[PDB]
Each structure stands twice: as structure tokens, then as C-alpha cells.
Symmetry: none
Subunit: 140 residues, 2 copies
């Protein structure tokens, strides 16, 4: 009167095997779609970091009139600025990992990834330089 | 003014260091704050993206408009985008778990948000495989 557990599980297994067969037969299409999306996300990531770096670069030389404010207050402002920037030093590291992995996989946008990375590393190294320049040139 | 503007940069520089460890605690306090801010902004972004996905994974189920070939194409793009973004939650785990391992002040909030993120990501995957199977009927 009752159906065996084995029969019930086998019915589910057959549904899964059919589903897996269909994904396997369309592996190439699936690969290309995922590759396109991975690049889209990577570009989104690069743009987010880039927009931020430029914002902090504008600041690292802006609001610079003469500074009738306590040397102490200006000091701790720069220390706050330095803390923010240090807090975000992980962003560029993650871009590298992402971009380099696709590069190592022969992703179709390798060359665009390559130049995008050196351009962000350049803007990043710049920000760290102008941050130091501002740091010592207030003690002088 | 030459001597005046030299007393200032000497008085501050004098108090600027009285014990290095206290200075270390201070900027550690500042870094922890911004590190937390970045995590929160990233978590809400992934949270928002995941919910948009769960919703899409159920608009029209068995309708007439699109044919089987078209619906299957749309579903494969859906799975593709989701898998393409599976690194999003990995990076948050790394960032959030590092703060927890340090004794960061918002540890509880962070631990709790990571848990809920994984739960929702897991059922996005689940629902996704359900929709896929349903299309083979």
C-alpha cells in the first residue's frame, strides 16, 4: 500500500540528474554568461574605489587657505584622514585578487583589466604621497 | 611672529607624545570606526542586491508570453549573474571575521549581520535551483 523510501528518493534523484544533464550540456554558454557578469561587477568595484580616491585627493589639498585653527585641531584632522585611508587599504588588494584571477583564466577582457588595475594603483599611490606631503608640511 | 609660531609647533609636538601606546589606542579607535563604516555600507549593498534577486525569482511563474527557449535563456542569465557575484559575501566574511577576531567594538552586530546575509544568500541559491527545475516540467 505504501511506497518505499528508496523509490521516493530515486524519483527525486532522477529529477536532479535531468537538471544536471541540461546544465552540463550548456556549459559553454553558462561560462560566457558568468564571465560577462564577473567583468561587470569588477568594473563596478573599480569605479567605486576610483570615485572615492578622487574625493580624498580633492580633500588632501582642499580647504587649504591658511589655517587660523589650532595646530592641534589640524593635526588630529589629518590623523582622522589617515585613519580613514588606512581603513580602506583593503579595497585595492581585493581588486588585484579579482582582476588577476580572471587574467589567469584567460578572461576575454584581460587587457582592459590589466590597464584598469595599473591606473587604480597609480591613483592610490598618488593619494598616499599627497597624504604624506600634507602630513610633514604642517609640522615643517 | 617667527618665535611665536615656533612655540606652538613645540607645545603641541610636546603633548603629541606622552606615551606611544595611548596614541596607538587613539588611532586604533579611529581606524576601527571607518573599518566598521566600510563593512556596513558593503553589507547593505549586498543585502539590497540579494533581495532584488529573491523577488525576481518569483514574478510570473507559469505564464503564456514567453516560449520555453526564451524562459530557459532568461533563467540561465539569472543563474550566471548570481554565480558571478558569489565572491561578494566571501569578501564580507573575510572583512567582518577579521574585526571579530581582533575584538572590534561592533563584534556582535557584525557577527549577526554575517549570519543573516548567509541565510538569505543560501535561499537565493535554493529558490534559484527550484525555479530551474520547475522549468523542465
Amino acid at each position: 500500500v505504501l511506497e518505499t523510501a528508496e523509490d521516493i528518493q530515486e524519483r527525486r534523484q532522477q529529477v536532479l540528474d535531468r537538471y544536471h544533464r541540461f546544465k552540463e550540456l550548456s556549459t559553454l554558454r553558462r561560462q560566457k554568461l558568468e564571465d560577462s557578469y564577473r567583468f561587470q561587477f569588477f568594473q563596478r568595484d573599480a569605479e567605486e574605489l576610483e570615485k572615492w580616491i578622487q574625493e580624498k585627493l580633492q580633500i588632501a589639498s582642499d580647504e587649504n587657505y591658511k589655517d587660523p585653527t589650532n595646530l592641534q585641531g589640524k593635526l588630529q584632522k589629518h590623523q582622522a584622514f589617515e585613519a580613514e585611508v588606512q581603513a580602506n587599504s583593503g579595497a585595492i588588494v581585493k581588486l588585484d585578487e579579482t582582476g588577476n584571477l580572471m587574467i589567469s583564466e584567460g578572461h576575454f577582457a584581460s587587457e582592459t583589466i590589466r590597464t584598469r588595475l595599473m591606473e587604480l594603483h597609480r591613483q592610490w599611490e598618488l593619494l598616499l604621497e599627497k597624504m604624506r606631503e600634507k602630513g610633514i608640511k604642517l609640522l615643517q
